[PDB]
Structure 1
Amino acid sequence: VCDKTVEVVKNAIETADGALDLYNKYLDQVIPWQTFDETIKELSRFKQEYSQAASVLVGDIKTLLMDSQDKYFEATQTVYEWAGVATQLLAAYILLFDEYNEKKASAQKDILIKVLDDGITKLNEAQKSLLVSSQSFNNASGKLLALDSQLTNDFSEKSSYFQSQVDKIRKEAYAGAAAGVVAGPFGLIISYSIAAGVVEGKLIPELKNKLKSVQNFFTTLSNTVKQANKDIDAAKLKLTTEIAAIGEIKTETETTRFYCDYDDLMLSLLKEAAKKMINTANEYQKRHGKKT
């Protein structure tokens, strides 16, 4: 009757492991969290130079990115705790094979069920955080679209904004000395001969270039936020399936007798299945700050 018991336990461990791996090898990897962290820290740059409307957008975008990041870490710390429970519990599971008996088999059953049970609990808590993270990415992406529209309007050659900058640069250059340099918006530095229009219509292309690069930046962020959103959505969807499968597996395990006459292969296969999740959990915790 062993091979059914073996099936159940292997499936239990591998299923739990696969859910953990949706964080460990998917979420932690395919979303550029680090890039987002750098971006958040930079977004206040040049805040006073944006139009009133653009400024509000950029600000709101920053907050929403901070929230998305905060929520992914909230998810991470919940799953971390499960990982820590799983790694110690599965090591005990492995050791209980030593000088096996019916008591130890019963102990193994309690251990597996706890790992599954704690898993369902923690992963479900984590889902709520992932959903919020998702909704903040989504709201951010919408605002990034509005911002792109706002900037096209602002940076348009015939706009009040753009003209207000062209003449500011001109005034400073006429009030300055020849063969100097003039500072513009968003960091721009220009040579006196470009600004004063010694060669007419050659200052504007410099301003256009700067403003376009600002817009290109927000477009790159938009593309990256949109992709992050699909990826987080795909993971949390897949997690809903896996959480439910863990639930069915827990119920089956509860009605499963662990004490049987396992052959050598079966023992090895069971130990290996447990070891693999232990490794996954250790790699996860180490990435998220677990110190030796």
Structure 2
Amino acid sequence: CDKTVEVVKNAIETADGALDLYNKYLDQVIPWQTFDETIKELSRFKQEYSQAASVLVGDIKTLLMDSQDKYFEATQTVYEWAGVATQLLAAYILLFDEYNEKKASAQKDILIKVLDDGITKLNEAQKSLLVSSQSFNNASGKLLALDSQLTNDFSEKSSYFQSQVDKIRKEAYAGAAAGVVAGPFGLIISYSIAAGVVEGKLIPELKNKLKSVQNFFTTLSNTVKQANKDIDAAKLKLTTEIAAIGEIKTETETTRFYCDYDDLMLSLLKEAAKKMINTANEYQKRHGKKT
């Protein structure tokens, strides 16, 4: 009965491998948690940016929210498959108890449903990943525009920079000749710097602050480009594995399940099922399943 054993193991392992492209690749290679925190932070200092930069920052936030949203959409689709797969595979395992030909037929129908539901759900999720990728790509384009915009805004000779300087100086002169003056983007400046008592230090302080803001977006820009590349890679690996599921499903359909399994064969088949039950449980747990 060794022939059936290798087809059936291959069926479960292939399905499992596809699930793991979410559970151990997509869920890991893109910093989802970091994007979530960044999305929630992105409106910070919104009134301080130039009009042009402010529009880009807002649109980047919206696109990153969409990338996240569509990732969550793909996730729920895969989660549904996982939840059904775990009940099915547990049923598969129990069917070995007091074995007979009716239970063998049921086992076969069950594994084919795992594979078939896999194809259907994973194909639906591919559409979500596609839109997530498109949104990362569009966010990237805007982040590239943002760099050039911030360069123009944050250069010393711009009216933007000059306004920032004038405001800080005006405030310093108008108050007491001690203490501190609040500037843009969280900058705090001592009176002596702001008022030029200590010579030539205000401009460098502002530049250092502004450069740090531009740097933040440069980092986000790199991180988005990387995410875009990785989600595209994941979506391609999934296309391949979805086809592989189809193949093994076909061979499974013509495979005879009713067999006089020995202890070894039984062990191997149950463990194969248990491996995917484990994958599915870990995935659903990460995505909020309680028990």
Q: Structure 1: give runs of 5+ residues left out of the alignment.
A: none
- Mapped to 1, the partners of 2:186 and 2:288 lie a distance apart of 38
Deviations 1:69-104 (A, max 9, x none): 000000000000100000010001001111111111
Q: Which deviations, in whole Å up to 9, do the C-alpha atoms of 1:214-270 show, x marking residues without a partner? A: 011101111111111111111110000000010111111111111122232111111
Corresponding residue of 2:239: 240
Q: C-alpha deviations, 1:118-171, integer Å up to 9, x for none?
A: 000000000000010011111111111110111011100111110111111111
State the secondary structure of the residue aligned to 2:157. Answer: coil
Deviation string, structure 1 residues 17-72 (Cα, Å, up to 9, x no partner): 00000111111112111111111111111111101110010000000000000000
Secondary structure in 2 matching 1:49? coil
Q: How does 1:101-250 map to 2 (within 5 A)?
A: 101-250=100-249
Count of matched residue pairs? 291
Structure 2: 5+ residue stretches without partners? none
Counterpart secondary structure, 2:47: helix
Q: Which residue does 1:280 correspond to in 2?
A: 279
Paired position in structure 1 for 2:81: 82
Stretch moving more, 59-68 or 264-273: 264-273
Q: Percent identity?
A: 100
C-alpha separation between the residues in 2 aligned to 1:37 and 1:157?
Answer: 33
Shift of 1:182: 1.0
How many Å separate the matches in 2 of 1:185 and 1:141? Answer: 26
Cα deviation, residue 194, structure 1: 0.1
Deviates more, 1:115-124 or 1:261-270: 261-270
| Cα distance between partner residues in 2 of 1:255 and 1:149 | 61
Offset of residue 6 of structure 1: 1.2
Runs of 4+ in 1 over 6 A off after TM superposition: none
1:180 Cα offset (Å): 2.5
Q: Structure 1 residues 254-263 or 274-283, which shifts more? A: 254-263
**For residues 281 and 71 of structure 1, what CA distance do their matches in structure 2 show?**
21
Distance 1:291 1:186 in 2: 41
Alignment partner, residue 61 of structure 2: 62
What is the TM-score of this pair, normalised by structure 2?
0.98
